[PDB]
Each structure stands twice: as structure tokens, then as C-alpha cells.
Amino acid sequence: ARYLGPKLKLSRREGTDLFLKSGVRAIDTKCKIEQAPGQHGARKPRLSDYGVQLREKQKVRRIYGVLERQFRNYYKEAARLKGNTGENLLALLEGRLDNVVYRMGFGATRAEARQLVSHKAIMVNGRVVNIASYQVSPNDVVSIREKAKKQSRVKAALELAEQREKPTWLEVDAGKMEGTFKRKPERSDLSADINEHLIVELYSK
Amino acid sequence: KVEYDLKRLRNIGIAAHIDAGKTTTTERILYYTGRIHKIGTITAAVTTCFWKDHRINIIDTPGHVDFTIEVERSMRVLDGAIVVFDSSQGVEPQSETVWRQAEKYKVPRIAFANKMDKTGADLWLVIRTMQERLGARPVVMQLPIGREDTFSGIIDVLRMKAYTYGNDLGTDIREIPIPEEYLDQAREYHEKLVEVAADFDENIMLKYLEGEEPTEEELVAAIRKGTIDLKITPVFLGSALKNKGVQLLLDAVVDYLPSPLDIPPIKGTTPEGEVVEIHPDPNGPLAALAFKIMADPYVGRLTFIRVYSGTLTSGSYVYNTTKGRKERVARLLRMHANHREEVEELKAGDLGAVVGLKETITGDTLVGEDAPRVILESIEVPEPVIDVAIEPKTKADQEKLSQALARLAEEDPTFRVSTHPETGQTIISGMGELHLEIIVDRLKREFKVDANVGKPQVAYRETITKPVDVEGKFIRQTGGRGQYGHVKIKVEPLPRGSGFEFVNAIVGGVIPKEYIPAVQKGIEEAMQSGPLIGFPVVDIKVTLYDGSYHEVDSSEMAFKIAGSMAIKEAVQKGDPVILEPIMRVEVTTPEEYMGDVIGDLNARRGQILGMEPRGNAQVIRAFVPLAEMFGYATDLRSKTQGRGSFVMFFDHYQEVPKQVQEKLIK
Amino acid sequence: NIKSAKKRAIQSEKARKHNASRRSMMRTFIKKVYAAIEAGDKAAAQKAFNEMQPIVDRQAAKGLIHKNKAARHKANLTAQINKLA
RNA sequence: AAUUGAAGAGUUUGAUCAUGGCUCAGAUUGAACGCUGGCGGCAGGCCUAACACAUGCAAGUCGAACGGUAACAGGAAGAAGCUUGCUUCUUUGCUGACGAGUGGCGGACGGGUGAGUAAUGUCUGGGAAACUGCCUGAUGGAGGGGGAUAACUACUGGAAACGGUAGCUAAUACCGCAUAACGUCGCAAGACCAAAGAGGGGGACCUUCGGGCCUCUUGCCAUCGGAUGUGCCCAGAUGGGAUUAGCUAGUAGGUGGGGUAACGGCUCACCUAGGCGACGAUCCCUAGCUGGUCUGAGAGGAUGACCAGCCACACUGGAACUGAGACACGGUCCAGACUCCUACGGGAGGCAGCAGUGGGGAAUAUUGCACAAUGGGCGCAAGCCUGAUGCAGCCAUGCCGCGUGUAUGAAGAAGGCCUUCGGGUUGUAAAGUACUUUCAGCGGGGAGGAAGGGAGUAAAGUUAAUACCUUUGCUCAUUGACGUUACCCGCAGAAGAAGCACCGGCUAACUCCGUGCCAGCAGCCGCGGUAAUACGGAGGGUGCAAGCGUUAAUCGGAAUUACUGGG
């Protein structure tokens, strides 16, 4: 139940980059971005509050590599909790182990960070964890297992991570490859071009 | 604690033409092999019995009676066979069949002369036939003391010992030496036996000419190594009713009857596609075939199976590739001639029944639950020979009948159900009179359905003799959608087997371009209900050479009618003729019966075509009307006492003898 | 029905047949009583009342007619004698 | 901190507003079907025929109540298998034990079912006239007699299931008699009722060497309470119909007897003439009730599978017996329907227990392992029994996680689809190249569910007492079905793992070709009669994903039964 297919071909559609070739070069181009997410590629997408109001969450979903089910529950979650309900849905995503590993630097792409967690190449407070879903909490201590450490991938991984805007709410290492999870990401940090009362309106009607 | 040497397995079938002694012979075998008594119904398909350190599996059921198929099914699974013969029936015309259909598969067998006590019971007379009819190389293995009413003891040449029977209850027997006279008669037959056994063991050949006697052990080896190759057939004897020659026939079993090992491996196919032998090793993949389902009141569905490779295990999981299904075998079971022995496993070459499984119907291939999802062969092709008309009375029964086959077609795929593609009524494919007959009891009884049972109808055809030409007018001018169509055609008969040909014979265009399609769909159409009885008026060429029209009134449709009128009448006018179906048939028969065979066919509105010999038989080709061709099986098998078989194909349609013209006006 | 405690059956037979008797005998006596009253025979009653009492109470603490039955009985019966006796 | 949450669209007209139906987008499911399908975790699994049922299992247990020996183990005066310590039979019940029999306790629980039942029901809340095994507190009893019986022996009828005579015998079986109050009866005075012994261990002493005796446990009877259970009354709520408006004779009330564990027309004689009913009786149809559950913003609507409470039923109708308890789910008698056996005379049985069969149906799974865990029965105990229960098997049925790779790759390959032939697109997609290896596969490692019981000891309880018994430690060897357990460690190679629907509008997604009111689509509006974004194929795309659809169905949208909230 992972997406699996042509990663880039997605960003094209959402009209952004979601960092799915995240890998190396960037601001795509060298890909084919934009004016043809299909064959009537040119064609203007004029559309519905429904079409726009979808594309937002649909896109977000794509960003984190979540599937509509888990996602719904995230939303119902956001709902269940106190706080701006879109904001919560965002945190809920941000606490994803997988998220919190690309966000450390350990992983080149989120889609890869996860590749590691599945393979128990990762620990929290001393227990190997290996479910991407795993919700991380303030004061946790995510890290690479010693075995399979400073390896191939994780190298450039931690690397280009620095060139990234670089988070805040996590202290990371590199020698260690250990990483604190320090607090729960504010609406303020991470964001701008992402519109929650849309992907709430959605599940709201 | 091996208890399974394999080389101790005897899987045998009792075949032979009806009357015989098959059934009776079996219950008997199942009394000796298990009378035990030591200081301490063919109840389901196959049964196990022990005879001197040897397990025997029997499947008596043959019957021959028209429909064999079953006989030829067990035959494939099992390895050995006794072809019981009725000693008495001497001018025996049906001793045959049975066998000529055995080597037909490739399996070894010994012969038994059963009623050696009933009048006319002449042993030789059989052999004077077993080489005269089928023509094999049987080997006298015994000589009876007291032909028929004077049935006392018997003698085994190979072992030159004499036994006797003081009664017929099967108790007071004994091995009493040769009674004065006789003796001499033996020798010679015991020499030829050894002389026969010579064509196998060179050792039993020299020692012959040198003056030494082959060892009672190397002698057996010859006979045995000789039968198993389908070269010889050891003949024995004894009144099975009087319990005589049975306990000796049983030895005859092991001594000459093949073991699951002496037999040639089953071929199967991988999921990829490639033949491959299936080795009788109780440690290779699990490969077993099924062959008989049965509903047990106590344990439910039972699926008797013949293992070939690996080994099925009680409380495991199997997999049927045939119907891609994961069956869960829970309990294994072996049928003892009187109780339910619950064992724990069947190793390759062994036979019994599993309990569980739901999707496993006949001929299913069960492998391990990971083994190469392979499928054996099994391909048997016994089609039908006799069918009937079955019209389920009021639509009510038409249903009870649907369910009828919905369960009866699984409990016996030796038939076929078909809805005549031309007239509702459904056909019931059988394999001989009796067959369909006894279905007619169960399908009507244990299904309470009560329909009709007459004969099929015949797919007739209409056409004409003389070519005609008539007007096709329509016009309806009153005030608006005028409806104006009209055409003239050229109708002309074509050779019986011509088809449908129209002719766009319009000059400048008196009949617009756009309307011709429709004037054809009209003619083409009308030809549906004939002018005589209402059948597909066919075998003609049509020519549209004229017809006018109107600027506003005409219609695509208005023309389809006009043309459907020109035709609806040219056929009425050109003198119609009720054509009918002619078949191609080929009766395979010994020119012995031939004489009348051809006759009967002539007196069937048919006309003969030839007979180019085949094998020992001879084939006859010719045409016939499907009407005067019904229930031919039980008519061919009449002029041939069974030695007759036929095929059938369609060919053409042809006029009815006029006398049959006004006949059909029904 | 085959199930060890077919016995249970035969047990309650012996049982019934026993209580049957007593119970009977007991009624028999209490009947002797209302008879007396029912006629007017003050003393004969009392007498037969005395006779039944011990048998009542007894058969009760024995079990087969526990407690308040006797009560009720010796009760109303009593009430009856000093009704018109 | 703890119900804080309410969205509309399409379609009447040439156009409009309104009214008004119809239709869709959401959630939900004990589902089914079509296509497709990798793993696991947890739940679910006959909704129809309360249809019929082969077989096996689902209730036993105590020898510390009893006469006992038939089985298998042992021993034994004494006889022997002898191969002069290894030991075999006559027996002998001598004890460890145990078939059959008596007795005791349990078979009124557990488990199944929804057929009946619109009130001997359920929920909510009060009440009084009651009984209550096993557990429990209090106080007394526990004296002394008797006659039976099964088992068994003889003889005997039966095919069998099961009897028939006559013996003989035991107890915690039965019955007397004594005893008798804080019991019952009675204002009182009086009167009246009960019972069972059994084991363990013991110095002196000793006797009919079995024991009396001493002591300890456990049982037996009685009344009073406790607790649990149960019966019982009352008012309120508890579906539809008036195209059912009248109902009722034990009927409503009284009295008196009788009745029950108890109040009571519960039953009867008698008197009264009442009693119910538009606040809906009666009649007819339907239904187990609840906690809950789905839906909704809520109010409502719909519902009452699994889990838990109550009720009801046990092939159908009827009935009592035994008992603390039943009018009994593997009890009894009758009647009925029905099947089985039979030697023909006569007999046996009821899966709505677990599994399984047939039948019905769109549909619903194994004749599994285990008493190791909790729990129930009997027992002092150990034990035995337990289809309760714990588990495993089957099915994508649901929910929940996981995987099916991760990077990198360009003038952007070929092929395919479009193309105004410039190219476009599929497309970082592929391939190439690095890197990872969870999960399936292999092989090792390896938790917890295990508390207790068993002996050894140490005491402290009692007691004549250090024996024995109760608790307490102490020590020692041990008790899982699951089970190749969870979890961990390695081995190899991307290796074994993607599919379904949609793309005219509602509605996210479009072009080409085929077709020519045909073939066909279609939830509504409506597509199709030669350039079809609607049919069918392809390319492309959109949505979902080991699922996707489709059908079925409840609520929602529906302010469209409008209390909230309309006319």
C-alpha cells in the first residue's frame, strides 16, 4: 500500500515540487515538470471548488506518501483532538517517524527515510521501530542503529539535508546519526502553500 | 516396522462381459484374504485385503454393458486385472470386448474360467477362443479334475501339485496328490508351460534342452516377467460359487500380478508446459489423482484417491490444481471388507479415501500445498451414442430438471446436456440404452420430475424448384407519410448447398441508392418462415432487377417490406420443396455381420457408399436421414451382438420423397 | 437415556413411592380430623387432632411437607375445634 | 480535560420565480456477487428451514458413607519359576486401587435458541405476605433400638432392551423410641417434631490385639441471623390498524372454607353486581425486552449479530415426579408427528450443546489440539470430568498495520497513442548503474502466559504430647494446548508479491479509431440515425489500493410527516 509509481509525475500534477526526486539536483526541470501531467498536458485545468478543494489534500497526501484511508483517520484524528483542526492534521503527519527522518537528514527522500524504517534501520528511545505510521512524541530520541551505520545512502542523505531550510524542532547529529525530537511543529514552521480548511472542508461536507 | 514394501502392492480390477462372475468372484476373494480366525456389497469403490504378506486393492464394477467408461477408468488408476470368463458360455460371442479395451490403455492381466461346474463348462473351449477371438498367448496353468458336474479337485502344472474340494461351502479342501489316471495329461502342459516360460528366461531354456528342471522360483520369474509385458495371459479356473480355484487364483495374483513398481510411471504437466514422469517414490512431490466421490452418512463426502508420488498425510493441507483450490485433508481412510480402518497416510502407489475437501470432483489432481502445481493426464474420451427428447411438461418441471443435472452432472460426467439450438427441447446425451434409461428413473424419481420422452426433431429447410419473378408493391398514399415502396425480383433455385445470393441489378437507379440495404434486410428476413411449414427457406439466388419509388413517400422501411413481399411470394409460387438433413456415418463391423448391417441401413431411406477394410474389421460409409436414424446404437449393436460401432457427421440437405411432403404438413 | 444417571431416575422412584406413602398416611390422618369437626364431635376431633399433630410436624421436619404446611394445618384445624367445641 | 457542531447539485419552462416529486455526492453492513488478491494483528462467521438429522464428543465424581472383589499392580502363612535371591501360583481383598451395585453431591450451572410472547415479559422506580443447596456468624444437641433391600447365589422368561421367583447382607438407605426450645401450634395452660457417622495421628494402660481410650479433622440433626438466589405485588414507559367500539360469569367485589414458601378468585360454596373501555379496551397484524448499535449537528429516524443483563423455548401438545431448586437442554409418563432396531412376539431415539451431514439459500468455516491458563462439578487431598474456556484450522468479511523496493538516470531510447508532421506525450517512467533486505523462504537463538501442586524441612497453632492436622517460611526436583510462540540473530538476492472503477454534467480525469437510433450505454438528466469527450477498443488521465466495483439495506442529504423545523 505504498504509492510505488512514477514519483515525479505526481508533483507535476500538483503544480509544485514535493521533493520526491528530492535526491540530488532540484527545482526540478531535468524531469519534464508542469505543462503535461498527462497527454492533454497543455490543457488548462479550470475547476470546481471541489477540484481545487481536493487537489490540496490530495497533494498533501502525496507529499507525505499517505493513502486515503490512513489519511482520513488522520483527519478524523485532527477532529478528535482540541486545536485548529487543520493544524492538528498537519502535526499528526509531522510526527510520522518516516517524516521525522527525512526531516533529520538520515533520509534523502521521505519515500526513502521510510525505506529505512521498514528495514528496522532506526530506533527511538532504544527500541528499534519499523512502522512508518509510528507517531513520535516530544523527548523521543530517534537514531540509526549502529549496525548498518554511516552507510552509502545515509551519507548524502544527512548531507543535502543541511542545504535544506533545515527544521528547528529537532536536534540532529551526524557522527552519531542520533536525533532528538524536541517539540510539536507549529502551523508557523513548515507550510505556506498548503491550505487546511480546504482539506477540512473536504472531509467536512 | 516398515509394513510397506510397495513391492507387496496388488491393485487389481475384475473385468469381463456381463453374466460372467465379476461381482460374485469378488465377495469370494473377500472371504479368503480375510477369514483369519487365529487365536486372538462392494462397500465403496476400492477395498483392501491381505493375502500372504501382500495388500490387495480391488475395484469390481466393470459390467461392460454398453457403457464401459467406468471400467476403462479404474483401469487407468489400477495396475493389474483378472479377466473373468464364463466357462459355460462357450459359443461365447461376448467373452470379448472387455480385454481388447484393456491393452487399449496398457495394463497386464490374468484369466479366470469361472463356471467350471456349469453345463458346457469346457476349459479348452475358452482358450480355443482366447486366441481365436482376441488372439493373445494364454498359458494353461491348471487342469480341472472332473469336468463340470464332477468338479472335485484341480492341478497346477507349474508346481505339479494336486488339490481337491470335498464340498462347495469352501471348507473341506486339501492338497491331495494326482488321482490315479490324469497324471500323464499333466507333464506335457507343464512342459509347454516351461517351454513357454522359455521365451523369457534363457536359463529355463537351456536347462530345458539339457535335461534339468527350472527351479520353482526361476520358473515363476519367467511367467511373471512375461505376463507383465503383455505377451502372455496365465489362465486358471474354478467355480467361484462353490469356492474352487479361488485360494489358488489368489496365489495366481501376487505370483504374476504386477506391483505398483513393475508398472510404467504416470505423465503429468508442469504449470509451464512440459510432460514429465511421476515417480512412485513416497518422498517426492505429493501427486495424487481422485476418482470417486461418495456421500457417507457417517463421515460425509468421501474422495477415493490413487497416489503416485509423495505421500498424503492425515491432518494436513493439499491443493487441487484442477480447480485451484486449497483442500484441507483431515482424516485418511481405508475400506476394509467389513469395517472402517482409519489410517494415517497413503504413500505413493497406495489407494483409499480422504475426508474433507469440497471442490474436489472426479479426475482431480492433488499436489502438496507448495509442490509444483502440476496436473496429471487422465484424458479419457468416451463420448455418447444415444440421445432422447426430454420436454419437462409445464414450465414447472422444466426447473426440477435444471437442478436434476446441476447435481447429476457432477455425480456422473459420462454424459452431456444440450438445449437444441433450434427448438427449445433438450437432448440427453448417453452411452447406451440402459444408460439414459436408468437416468429416466432417478431423474424422474429421486427428482420427482415428470416430463416427456420421445425423440428429437429434424432441422428441415425450405426452398424451391422453378425460378419465378413477381411484383413487390406497397404504396399507401392517403395524405402525408405516403409510404411508397415497390420492387421486382428474379428468384432462381440453387444447388442443394448453395446458400444466399442477392443481385443489385438496378440500371440507372430507378430504386435509390440509400434504400437497397433495406430492401435486402427485408428479403433476407422474410426467408425465415418457410412457405410450407415455416423453416429457413434456403439455397437460392435473388435478383433485384427493378422497382420504382416516390420522392417524399418512400422510406428505408417501406422498401424492406416491399422486398420482403417479393420474396414472401416467389417461393410460394416457384413450387416449394421440404429439404431435410443427411448424415455421414461409418459403422465399424466384422464383415461377419456386415451382410445385414448394410441391409438394415438400406431399409432406412439411406444409400450406401463403400467399405475399405480396417484391422480385422471393415468400415461402411453412407448417408441417412436424421429422422430414420434415431436410437441407432441399440440397432447396430443388434446386427452385431456388440462387435459394432459407428460415428456420424452432417453433410447436406435434400428433398423429401413427396410422400413425406404431405406427411410433414403438421 | 444412556447417561450414567439413568440412576437418577430410579433414585426418585424409590423416593416418590416412599413419600407417596407417608404423604398419603399423613393426609388420611388430617382427613380423619376435619371429619370429626365437620360432624360436631368436639372430643373425637381433639383426640384425632392429637393423633395427627406429631405425624404432621414430623413429616414436615422430615422434609416432605416442610414447615408452614403443618402450621397452616394444625393452625386452622385448631381454630375449628374451639369453634364449636 | 470529558457528545464544542449544521454545505449542496441535476431535472417541469423558450426564458423566470415558486411549488413539487424524483436523482446523486457521506457514512454504515453478520453481507452477497464480478474482477483481482502478498503478510500479519485483532475481531466476525446459518441473517434462510424453531428443517431433518449418520457418527464421535458436550456431566460427572467420592472407596475419607457401604457391602465389596472383577480388572492390574504389587505383596503373603504356605506352597516354588530356581539360572541357591533374581524369583512364580494355589490362592488370599492383605492395601495401592477399581468394573458392576447402594449411598452422597452435581445432572435446575455451564452451553444453544428467538419459535412463542405487545405483558405470568422487558426497562425504570417503590412495596410485602415469602422460601433459599453449597459458603457463612451464634447456640445446643449428637441417646438407644429395629425390619429391610441392590449388589451377590440358585433356579428361571426373553432375539434383544429388559425381566421372573426364592435366598443372603452392609451403611452417611429407611423407620421407630428416647431427648425437645430462643421451634411450631396455641392469649395461656398445655401439646409436638431431629439427627450419621467417617478418617488421621497417639503415650502410659490394657482388653474378646479388629479396637475401647486420648486427641484432631471432617461430616450428622436443631432454631436464630448473614450473604446469594428465587417467588411475589405495585405505578410509569414499553410496536401498527377504528376498513375492529364495545368487552367480561371466576367475570369485578364480599364472606367462609380449602390451597401454596408466601400475598392473592389461587380454588370453591355463598352473597354482591360489579370490573375494563376513546387517557383506545376488545379484536386483528407484527415483535423477545434492555444496556447498547448505525445514522444524524442535535432533536429524531433505523435497529437489537458478536459482548453483557432479564425473559422465553429444548421435535410438537400435555403432565406431574424427584429436589434446596425444574414442572428439567443430553430426566420421567401420556398423546402426536417421525426415524431407527427386531429372530416379528417386541423394542430405541430427538444436535436450538461442539464438530459434521442432508435440505433451503446470494451466502456462513474443521467430524482439530488441550485441560497448561481462568472457571465449574465431585473430592479432605491428589486427582478425575469439563466441545464452559483456552487455543489452532477455514473464509480479504471488517477493522489495523506492512509489503510489493530506495536512490540515480536523459536530450529524454526504442515501441505505443496524438500530431496542425516542427513535435507531443507515456516519462524518471524504462533499461544502466549503484544502495537497502522488514515481510514470505532457510537456518540458529529464544521471553511470558506458571499461579500451584509434589516431597523434604523450620518453626508457630493446638493437643498428653515434639506424632497427625492448619498456616507460615525454607530448600529440591517439577507441571503449557498453543508451539517451528512472540521477540532477537544471522544467509541470499529486487529477489516472491497489483489490482479494480471511472474520465458528458452532476464529478476528479480526453483525445484517435471502430460503429451509424445498429451494436450498445444509462444513478438522474440522456447518449447512439457518418467526424460519439456518453456505445466498444486504444493512448492518456482521475480515484481508490490488496483491494475495486456492483447489488442489497439503514440513516443522511429530505425544512420531503416540519418538537426542534412546513403548509
**Which CATH number does the domain housing residue B419 bear?**
3.30.70.870
Inside any domain, residue B441: yes
> Measured between alpha carbons, how far is residue B510 from residues A13, B80, B337 in Å?
62, 82, 90
Domains of chain A: 7-93+190-203 (1.10.1050.10), 94-181 (3.10.290.10)
Number of domains in chain C: 1
Closest nucleotide over all strands to C3 (CA to C1'): D330
Chains touching C by CB (3 or more pairs below 8 Å): none
Inside any domain, residue B395: no
Q: Which three cell numbers stand for residue A174?
A: 551526524
Q: Which residue has the cell 490315479?
A: B180
What is d(CA B354, CA B580) in angstroms, rounded to the nearest whole number? 53
Nearest CA to B481 out of B559, B563, B558 is that of B558
Q: Which three cell numbers stand for residue B114?
A: 469361472
- List, in order, residues 6 or more apart from B61 with CB less than 8 Å away: B22, B42, B45, B70, B71, B74
Which region holds residue B509: left if phi is over 0, alpha if psi is between -120 and 50, else beta? left
What's the CA–C1' distance between B557 and D517, in Å? Answer: 14
What's the CATH code of the domain at B651?
3.30.70.240
What's the CA–C1' distance between B28 and D402, in Å? Answer: 64
Residue type, C64: L
Query: Secondary structure of chain A in the HEC alphabet?
Result: CCCCCCCHHHHHHHCCCCCCCCCCCCCCCCCCCCCCCCCCCCCCCCCCHHHHHHHHHHHHHHHHCCCHHHHHHHHHHHHHCCCCHHHHHHHHHHCECCHHHHCCCCCCCHHHHHHHHHCCCCECCCCECCCCCCECCCCECCECCCCCCCCHHHHHHHHHHCCCCCCCCCCECCCCCEECECCCCCCCCCCCCCCCCHHHHHHHC
Geometric angle at alpha carbon B50, from B44 and B55, rounded to 5°:
80
Inside any domain, residue B587: yes
Residue type, B653: Y
C1' of nucleotide D366: residue with nearest CA: B330
**Whether residues B116 and B56 fall in one domain:** yes
Chains touching B by CB (3 or more pairs below 8 Å): none
With the CA atoms of C5, C8, C10 and C11 taken in that order, what torsion angle do they form, in degrees rounded to the nearest 10? 140
Measure CA of the first residue to CA of the last residue in chain B; give whole Å.
79
From B579, B611, B631, the end of a domain falls on: B579
What is d(CA B423, CA A161) in angstroms, rounded to the nearest whole number? 79
Q: Is B111 helix (H, G, I), strand (E, B) or coil?
A: strand
Structural domain for B138, as ranges: 1-263
**Whether residues B78 and B6 fall in one domain:** yes
**Whether residues B474 and B440 fall in one domain:** no
- List, in order, residues 6 or more apart from B63 with CB less than 8 Å away: B18, B22, B70, B71
Nearest CA to B117 out of B154, B74, B156, B76 is that of B154
What's the CA–C1' distance between A203 and D296, in Å? Answer: 16
What's the CA–C1' distance between A68 and D544, in Å? Answer: 8
Identify the sign of the CA torsion C2, C8, C12, C14: positive
Closest nucleotide over all strands to A32 (CA to C1'): D427
Phi/psi at B590 (5° precision):
-70, 125
Inside any domain, residue B382: no
Inside any domain, residue B401: no
What's the CA–C1' distance between B158 and D141, in Å? Answer: 99
Strand D footprint nucleotides (protein C-beta < 7 Å): 1, 5-7, 25, 38, 54-55, 59-61, 101-107, 130-132, 174-176, 183-186, 191-195, 221-223, 257-262, 321-324, 328, 330-332, 348-350, 356-360, 366-368, 393-395, 400-412, 416-418, 424-429, 434-439, 488-490, 498, 506-511, 539-546
Inside any domain, residue B269: no
- List, in order, residues 6 or more apart from B402 with CB less than 8 Å away: none
**Whether residues B160 and B299 fall in one domain:** no
Inside any domain, residue B398: no
**Whether residues B452 and B479 fall in one domain:** no
What is d(CA A92, CA A94) in angstroms, rounded to the nearest whole number? 5
What's the CA–C1' distance between A121 and D487, in Å? Answer: 17
From B525, B557, B579, the end of a domain falls on: B579
Q: Which residue has the cell 429421486?
A: B446
Structural domain for C38, as ranges: 1-85
Q: Which three cell numbers stand for residue B513?
A: 441508392
What is d(CA A200, CA A197) in angstroms, rounded to the nearest whole number? 5
H helices of B299-412, in order, are 397-408
**Whether residues B490 and B524 fall in one domain:** yes
Cα B162 from chain centre: 43
**Whether residues B633 and B656 fall in one domain:** yes
> Measured between alpha carbons, how far is residue A155 from residues A112, A177, A181 in Å?
13, 10, 21
**Whether residues B486 and B529 fall in one domain:** yes
Number of domains in chain B: 5
What's the CATH code of the domain at C75?
1.20.58.110
Closest nucleotide over all strands to B355 (CA to C1'): D367
Inside any domain, residue B389: no
Q: Which three cell numbers stand for residue B90?
A: 462357450
**Whether residues B448 and B473 fall in one domain:** no
What's the CA–C1' distance between A50 and D525, in Å? Answer: 21
What is d(CA B43, CA B155) in angstroms, rounded to the nearest whole number? 34
Resolution in A: 8.3
What's the CA–C1' distance between C50 and D177, in Å? Answer: 18
What is d(CA B251, CA A197) in angstroms, rounded to the nearest whole number? 93
